[PDB]
Amino acid sequence: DSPDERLQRRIAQLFAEDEQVKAARPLEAVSAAVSAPGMRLAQIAATVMAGYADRPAAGQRAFELNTDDATGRTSLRLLPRFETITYRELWQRVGEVAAAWHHDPENPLRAGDFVALLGFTSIDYATLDLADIHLGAVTVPLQASAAVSQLIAILTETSPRLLASTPEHLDAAVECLLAGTTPERLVVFDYHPEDDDQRAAFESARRRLADAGSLVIVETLDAVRARGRDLPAAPLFVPDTDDDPLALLIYTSGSTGTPKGAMYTNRLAATMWQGNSMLQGNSQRVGINLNYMPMSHIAGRISLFGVLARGGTAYFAAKSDMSTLFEDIGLVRPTEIFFVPRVCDMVFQRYQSELDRRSVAGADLDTLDREVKADLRQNYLGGRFLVAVVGSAPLAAEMKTFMESVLDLPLHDGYGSTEAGASVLLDNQIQRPPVLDYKLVDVPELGYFRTDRPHPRGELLLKAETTIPGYYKRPEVTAEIFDEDGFYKTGDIVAELEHDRLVYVDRRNNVLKLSQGEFVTVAHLEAVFASSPLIRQIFIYGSSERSYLLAVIVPTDDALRGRDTATLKSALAESIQRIAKDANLQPYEIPRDFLIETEPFTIANGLLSGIAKLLRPNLKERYGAQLEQMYTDLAT
Ligand SMILES: Nc1ncnc2c1ncn2[C@@H]1O[C@H](COP(=O)(O)O)[C@@H](O)[C@H]1O
To answer: What detail does the entry give on cofactor binding?
Structure first.
């Protein structure tokens, strides 16, 4: 069997033996209806919900409430299984919310009003999101990672009439409202009043707003639906054929703090359903997936909407910090996955741990490795993967090879952006559609030229059907992302192998010139060193005044075990050297010294984004002083 033949053989067994997978094949009549010319965003949703009515649409983990008789506290506790809701039931919930908002006797919502949502991803989140779509309200999915000051700025700029929040974000939400922002109602969702912690947050919100003399109505999503259940059906918002109104703002920061609201019109939002991408809906692939990325990111919206578009089932991860990710994947057994490199890291770290534990005397090492990967593939990852994509950040060549040997299928490298669209580059190939044209521009100061070495290099400029028109209420910032000829400037350096074949290098702003005149690509190198078995996380740092790099390294638990600081450092240094040799790195690409950090980078401490990407500005603010001091200590 060839590698594709192995894959096709696994897939046929699945369609022969697995009733869940068979029952979830997309219906071509539904897909054709969705694809029809003239279909607007809400018409797509309604058509999908009607076409797949009796199928399971969405799942989340079952739960129980537990009272501790010592503390007297009642706490929600997750069970190791998922429960689903049908398309019919989801759309019914959506219709209840839309009715409640449209037919409110005093202050109803109208098309074009902004609605702000503070959460992760969940059935309730999907319900609010689709209800916005139903009424043509503009969704503003706020990043849970944002600081309150940033949230206030966003709300000030968008003037939402409604703010919805999960209990754990009620602290931030109340501060936003006490600051005199525009929302008229605060809707609490993902809410279980039987949990004492959640109930206390909800009561506190209610109390604090009342005490401040706020006229905000605080209410539960369940109560909104109860209202809507006794109101007439709401109209479905369908813009006229010549109009493409705003439907969604996706806030995105880049390097520098400064969140900007990427404008997603009705047509752009619809591509999340019916689009080109591997994981968007223009496909007959069975979509059973685990949604673990927030709805505040485009990859999280695609992972939901692209699956709904194909009549599949979207399961929502229980926690936003990936701490339940593999328990969830093992239960869901998805047919498809969008990896981010941090998840690949976790799979690699599981592999290393299991391989070490099982490499006992008398183990056959020429066999064990295969068995450890088979166990990962079949059990840890569910054993039903038909396809796998990695995106959002670079994955090192060796880690890609590793992941393919575990998955035993291709790991497609998908390059895209909030500004440009998800498709753009797939396995180094320009995707047409949506790309219309592209151009490489020289960046003399970074040493990238059309006349370069084996391949032309430079900044990628593109035109695509999926590019945003600009950022909301930011005329200046908008004008700088487009050149005189209308090309979107990606900020990304690429190498052009042939026409329509491009290799991603790094962000322009990550390209660092060392003092001796060599260029290093800092995020690319971070990815390379992910392949160290001793490294849990790594941040690479350099200064153009220096001839070498430094790093902040979070070691694995096993790396730490039974080692003092000095021996840990030498072990890390030895590993870095091996990894470097394997990846054929130049000596100037190798960190010469580093800080050991035993506290991992997380969303909670501001060092990771909501999709587990290193936040470089926050890492520089956190460690920059210590790192420049290390430079100084080494110089003296
Ligand atoms: N497959 C990929 N490989 C490397 N970098 C990527 C990939 N996909 C996205 N990125 C990076 O992520 C940026 C988009 O970030 P955002 O719009 O915040 O999701 C791009 O401009 C790239 O720098």
So the answer is: Binds 1 phosphopantetheine covalently.
